[PDB]
Amino acid sequence: VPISPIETVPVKLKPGMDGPKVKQWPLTEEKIKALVEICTEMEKEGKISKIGPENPYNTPVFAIKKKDSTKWRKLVDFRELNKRTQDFWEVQLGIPHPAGLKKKKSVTVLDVGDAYFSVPLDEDFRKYTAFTIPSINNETPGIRYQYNVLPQGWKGSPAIFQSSMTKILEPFAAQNPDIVIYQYMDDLYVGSDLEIGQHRTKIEELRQHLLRWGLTTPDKKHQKEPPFLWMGYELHPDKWTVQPIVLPEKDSWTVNDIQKLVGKLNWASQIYPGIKVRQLSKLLRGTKALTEVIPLTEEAELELAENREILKEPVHGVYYDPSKDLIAEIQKQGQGQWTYQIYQEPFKNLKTGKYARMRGAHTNDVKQLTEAVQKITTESIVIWGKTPKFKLPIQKETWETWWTEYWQATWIPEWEFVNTPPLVKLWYQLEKEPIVGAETFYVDGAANRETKLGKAGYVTNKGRQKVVPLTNTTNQKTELQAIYLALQDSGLEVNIVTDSQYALGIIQAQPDKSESELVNQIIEQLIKKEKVYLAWVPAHKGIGGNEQVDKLVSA
Amino acid sequence: IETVPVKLKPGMDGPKVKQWPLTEEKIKALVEICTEMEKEGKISKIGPENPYNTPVFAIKKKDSTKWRKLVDFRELNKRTQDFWEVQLGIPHPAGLKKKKSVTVLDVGDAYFSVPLDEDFRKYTAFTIPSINNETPGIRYQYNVLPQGWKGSPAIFQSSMTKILEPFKKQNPDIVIYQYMDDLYVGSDLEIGQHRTKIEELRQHLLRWGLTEPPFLWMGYELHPDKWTVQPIVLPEKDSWTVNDIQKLVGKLNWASQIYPGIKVRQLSKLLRGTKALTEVIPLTEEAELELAENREILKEPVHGVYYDPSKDLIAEIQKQGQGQWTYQIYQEPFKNLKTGKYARMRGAHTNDVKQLTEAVQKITTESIVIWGKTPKFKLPIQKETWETWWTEYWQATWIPEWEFVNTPPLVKLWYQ
């Protein structure tokens, strides 16, 4: 029975660079005796070949003891050759998410670990894979060898293997559309939606198809049945979840102890609803000092204690059914926290997740909800190839007022309101025109940049005025303080005239929460008002009210 | 044919741009399109020894119910040599922007008949992604001139002038310009006869093509002699409120950065006190004087403004609400080369991003007709929202560059 030849992939070195010439380290006699035995068997299998002294390249080789078994293991240090090898199209960059796996009746895993060292290497590239087995007592030249197949640990071997395996599996998948095959390292995941009797028959057909290229896979019942242990998940036949993470308790948490926490909670948040990690991730700023056992925050242990009520009972996700709509629900959790669940029928989720607000100076809930929708949208297109329908905690009228008056263009895909508090709302809305019968407050601020001394205040049309002296302030700070005084001292409706482009830029961004306490105070004032018209005029232009309060403030 | 000496710029590697996620409908369409293209020899499968990549997606122009393949060659186009050995950039037809009826043709399919440099094909690599990474991405590289690449019109420029020589000699009043995959054709006659004599130009490519049939079916018809110019205009009122005079003084202060003789001393004099915003202020004839000179100053063009082909064109867009969008094209601040407004957009009365998106396309088309160059956009939209949705509404075969404005500009009201 002749074997079909696996077509070789032409591989070149990086332009200008040469191959490796790193010398060989001295090994003990038992290590050398073990390598000679290994390399003799590999040579009999065609994997490697003895080369003459005309090959001037070398790659260091080692021998490491296998666990339990007394038999040694061979290892080549291709690190230097991988630095001089061309770039490849890495195809294993993204792995499937379990939530996107379609419902299949029977799934089978095939181990093709032998095939990795059975894929030929480019004939013109083997000369750069040369390595040397040092001789006993260094009294004869080392046994020179070069690889004929894809060497374990070479930069291009993972990509060339999958590409070679894909070309082999193409005719079978084409002539078997009821068969879904997924390849990953030395594993073949073959599932189908038919009866088990027709499954193992088509499974056997795949074995003979692979035998044509000399690739044999175990026939006896594999020790890896649902659920699988694949990339941190548990792949049961009907459901999926993360590998159980018993996140531990600790008396004194350090930098590496909380980074072990931070990583492990974000992994569990894809199936466990309502996971929060920010207060724990808040303990990571500055340099990455491994000798710093930072104390804990009280607002990090009570939120930790909340992560346990979710991580106590096992929660599973279902698989994707393309015949039912895809839904995504969002909840506001506070302090820039959003959580989401993607599902198709009530009670059972496909996956969950969280979104953290971007580090910014000013923000509001509507912006944050929008960004989370875009995130869920991009992740859904990856996993399922379609945008889900959204259930959002925001009234249709609220969103309509927001997007029609927002200065930016903004949009969210098809969505419906879900009455699940806390509801995202507009806390204030400025007027488009001046308010008749409302007092007009002309405000201004000014600070001395040298002594940090400043003043802020207002003058109104009813003769009301105020000027407050300030210490440890700036021009920008007094401009905001002026507006705050006007809001603090006016009735329910008020017109405010300012010259501060700085303040307008903040307010026209329409925040509801700020890192600046002065902005937050302004916001609390705006919320209490009925109507607020904020007008801008240019400074130092002799504009009355503004000019007459510019002199009082810069006095 | 069979000869196209083309390489990369010295000191630059090929594009390695990541493919962004695609919906199921677009992946299937790209699979169908590319399967046929592979059979016609337009593209070939490639192995992992090709690391380069350029993103691809599908485009469904409302003119047809079939999908089109769009390759975003922006990164590649920056990295290929400038084709001056052919032409040092054919002088942009200034008669294009002085025409009443300019129509665009998609002559991109004509590029597919000319082969591409065998050593250059590796740089046109692209990936059809799979859903959920369930299968490796289907990878292809172009064998002929790709649609959207800068080198495709530059190489085809020798052949394109030969198919058009009889038509150009038959009508020297008609000026033809080519940008990327588009042919810009202008005429000054009736619309009913316009579409017929454009079909005369259309049938030159069919006779050359044969040497469903793939040729031209649609023509997006523009009228660049009926386009928007937006001068700075001041209100005309019989009674002015304090608020009215504040906004006017602010507008005039802003326009004084563009025009020199703009004075606001006498109008700010009207705001002599601390009055209520809605209080009507009578205009003193000395301030009415000052408003008159400013009005006449705004009638004249901007002083010392010019176009420089070495510098980049910048387009800023403002959202004005209720479908209105204002824009300015410039190179130096306050030296605008063109301003305009867009009142209504095709549908999208509930979709802001669709409106902005096709506003960007219109502004780019206008920029191509006037200067033969696309501008760099400053977009009033969060990056994550734009990047998520602009491909769903795109139509043009080219793609410009853009940045994102995250601070609300104060000058929105002055262009309104």
Ligand SMILES: CCOC(=O)c1cnn2cccc(C#CC3CC3)c12
């Ligand atoms: C043929 C791939 O198998 C499926 O599409 C599938 C369907 N149901 N199901 C249940 C458990 C495990 C897998 C899996 C897998 C591969 C590792 C990704 C699975």
